[PDB]
Design a protein around this ligand. Structure first.
Ligand SMILES: Nc1nc2c([nH]c(=O)n2[C@H]2C[C@H](O)[C@@H](CO)O2)c(=O)[nH]1
Length: 292
């Protein structure tokens, strides 16, 4: 594990000697939308119908609003704290071309998020901008999510499948999903009616899992890779957007080809570490706003 032990406190849990764990790297590397940076450096987020605040002090991490039982069954896995990222980075850094990206995002960890929330979140992410995506997801939660309180503030859990089934295309449109409102509604019904089952989809191997997810309206190859990587731990995924495409052409002189071919080229080169590889690539590419 990438931590030595924990210690339960009054209203929190302290993780001792965490390794490969930085707040900005984890929360701003592109994998999540409901974690917000606070004035003091901490981050507050809403996941699994719960509000959590995370802080790093030295080599320790404090997770407020949770107990040891919650840490053991929910959060330790949420933060993928059982996987050794030192090995991942060591293996990838063998490629001198990846070192710079890996070192820049050294504290990245791929969270184990909820499939349903992730499915709708990334359908919303397609050709969108960060602000609109976050706004839309929050709007959907405020409108139909369980109300929550933390330190004098109200927050909204992500809505259940049943509550969202009540939504009309117009509702998603009012939350500003734009033309994607149609995809959200179509997708929620497929979930509700039982046509597509997320937990079953998640039990399939990387390639099968991927194919199924593409059955959802608004879900193409890129979005499918994001969904299975971020919520179904299918590590051979290699999400290709314009940022990953740039970093890829720039480093391996890959010629301008389809996203599918860039995806095939990435997965071929990184295998089981493809997902981790693209996150480092993506994070570095976007924060440094690289060009041809
Ligand atoms: N390849 C890739 N693309 C992503 C991720 N997260 C994310 O939002 N995107 C896309 C969505 C949208 O196309 C743009 C938003 O910055 O980047 C992500 O984690 N990986």
């Amino acid at each position: 594990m990438d931590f030595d032990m924990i210690e339960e406190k009054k209203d929190s849990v302290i993780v001792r000697n965490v390794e490969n764990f930085e707040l900005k790297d984890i929360f701003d590397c592109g994998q999540c939308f409901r974690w917000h940076r606070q004035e003091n450096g901490n981050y507050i987020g809403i996941a699994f119908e719960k509000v959590v605040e995370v802080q790093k002090i030295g080599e320790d991490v404090v997770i407020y609003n949770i107990n040891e039982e919650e840490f053991k069954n929910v959060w330790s896995e949420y933060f993928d704290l059982y996987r050794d990222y030192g090995e991942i980075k060591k293996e990838l850094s063998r490629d001198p071309l990846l070192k710079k990206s890996v070192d820049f995002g050294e504290g990245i960890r791929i969270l184990r998020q909820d499939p349903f929330e992730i499915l709708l979140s990334f359908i919303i992410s397609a050709n969108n901008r960060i602000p609109m995506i976050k706004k839309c997801i929050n709007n959907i939660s405020e409108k139909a999510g369980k109300k929550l309180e933390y330190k004098g503030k109200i927050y909204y859990a992500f809505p259940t499948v049943d509550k969202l089934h009540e939504f009309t295309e117009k509702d998603f449109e009012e939350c500003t999903a734009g033309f994607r409102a149609k995809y959200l509604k179509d997708t929620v019904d497929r979930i509700y009616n039982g046509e597509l089952n997320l937990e079953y989809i998640k039990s399939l191997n990387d390639n099968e899992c991927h194919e199924e997810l593409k059955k959802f309206m608004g879900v193409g190859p890129q979005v499918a890779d994001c969904i299975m990587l971020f919520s179904m731990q299918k590590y051979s995924a290699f999400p290709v957007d314009t940022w990953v495409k740039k970093a890829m052409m720039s480093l391996y002189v890959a010629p301008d080809v389809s996203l599918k071919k860039i995806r095939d080229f990435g997965r071929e080169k990184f295998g089981s570490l493809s997902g981790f590889a693209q996150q480092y690539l993506f994070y570095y590419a976007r924060e440094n706003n690289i060009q041809l």
